[PDB]
Amino acid sequence: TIVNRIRTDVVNVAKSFGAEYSEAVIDQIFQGFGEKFTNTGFAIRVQNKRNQKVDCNIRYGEAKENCLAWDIARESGLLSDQGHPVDTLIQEMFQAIPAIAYGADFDINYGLVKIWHLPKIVPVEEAFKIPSLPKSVNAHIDFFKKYHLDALCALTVDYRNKSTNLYFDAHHPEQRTTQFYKNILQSQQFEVPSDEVLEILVNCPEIAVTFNWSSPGIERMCFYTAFVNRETVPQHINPVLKKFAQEAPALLDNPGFLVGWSFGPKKGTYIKIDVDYHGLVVPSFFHMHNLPLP
Ligand SMILES: CC(C)=CCSP(=O)(O)OP(=O)(O)O
Numbered sequence: 207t208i209v210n211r212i213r214t215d216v217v218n219v220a221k222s223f224g225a226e227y228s229e230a231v232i233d234q235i236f237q238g239f240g241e242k243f244t245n246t247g248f249a250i251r252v253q254n255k256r257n258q259k260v261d262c263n264i265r266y267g268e269a270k271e272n273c274l275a276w277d278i279a280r281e282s283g284l285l286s287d288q289g290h291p292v293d294t295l296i297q298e299m300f301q302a303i304p305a306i307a308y309g310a311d312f313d314i315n316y317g318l319v320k321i322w323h324l325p326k327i328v329p330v331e332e333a334f335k336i337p338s339l340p341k342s343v344n345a346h347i348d349f350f351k352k353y354h355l356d357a358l359c360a361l362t363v364d365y366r367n368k369s370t371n372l373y374f375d376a377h378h379p380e381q382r383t384t385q386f387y388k389n390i391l392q393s394q395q396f397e398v399p400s401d402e403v404l405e406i407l408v409n410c411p412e413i414a415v416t417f418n419w420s421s422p423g424i425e426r427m428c429f430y431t432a433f434v435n436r437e438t439v440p441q442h443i444n445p446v447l448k449k450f451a452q453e454a455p456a457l458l459d460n461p462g463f464l465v466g467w468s469f470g471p472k473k474g475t476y477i478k479i480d481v482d483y484h485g486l487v488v489p490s491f492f493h494m495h496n497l498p499l500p
Pocket residue numbers: 311320322360362364371373414416428466478
């Protein structure tokens with residue numbers, strides 16, 4: 207079955223990258239969501255957020271107007287009350303802005319970590335009316351305006367990290383220059399990457415910004431770039447990129463990949479890479495950002 211193949215592939219990735227994981231957590235996740243994994247926009251992610259340790263996450267999205275993952279997770283015990291603003295945030299998001307899709311992310315050593323809301327691209331002001339957003343979001347209105355973050359294309363709630371991300375369609379001509387990325391990173395006193403990386407970032411169609419309830423500033427930002435096959439991933443930049451691009455499992459022999467380049471002060475600077483397990487994620491990514499499939 208597809209669900210058994212997926213579970214085996216997930217465990218094999220965790221073993222190969224040395225990622226921490228719990229068999230009991232994987233059982234809980236698949237009891238709730240394994241069927242969803244078989245026929246939606248499913249991806250396996252690895253990231254090198256920690257020193258000499260790779261973490262493994264699995265995630266999916268699907269085109270429903272309602273947040274099915276929240277109900278499944280609550281009924282399943284994967285999402286308990288946190289005693290925290292996150293407890294109502296996703297519900298407020300779905301009340302404030304109509305969604306065309308939703309998704310959910312799981313850490314295989316922990317359980318459910320994120321749920322996201324996918325609207326049609328909307329003006330970022332539509333988000334400011336959400337009651338339980340961190341105060342730092344509304345406090346960054348001028349920052350958003352200055353860096354052409356006006357086209358909101360997703361929102362995420364991170365229940366484990368107690369943070370929220372706003373996602374922007376990086377449509378503006380200034381976002382096609384390397385100086386834009388140097389400027390936005392320097393505005394936060396974040397680490398500026400090499401020229402090679404900057405030349406990859408100028409093609410980013412999606413920019414995420416992370417906010418939390420413990421600081422007035424941006425926690426980290428992330429630049430997303432997609433690659434249509436294993437070979438066009440920039441494997442030479444980091445050994446996790448090379449190993450995952452060459453060895454990640456999928457239902458197709460040569461799948462596409464989504465790479466997230468994260469930057470922070472703390473740490474917050476690392477790479478994330480997701481395999482398009484069924485082949486739906488990467489075309490969907492280009493289509494939602496009004497770009498042709500390269
Ligand atoms: C890609 C967007 C639309 C939802 C996925 S959640 P993410 O991987 O961007 O979240 P992190 O900030 O990396 O934890």
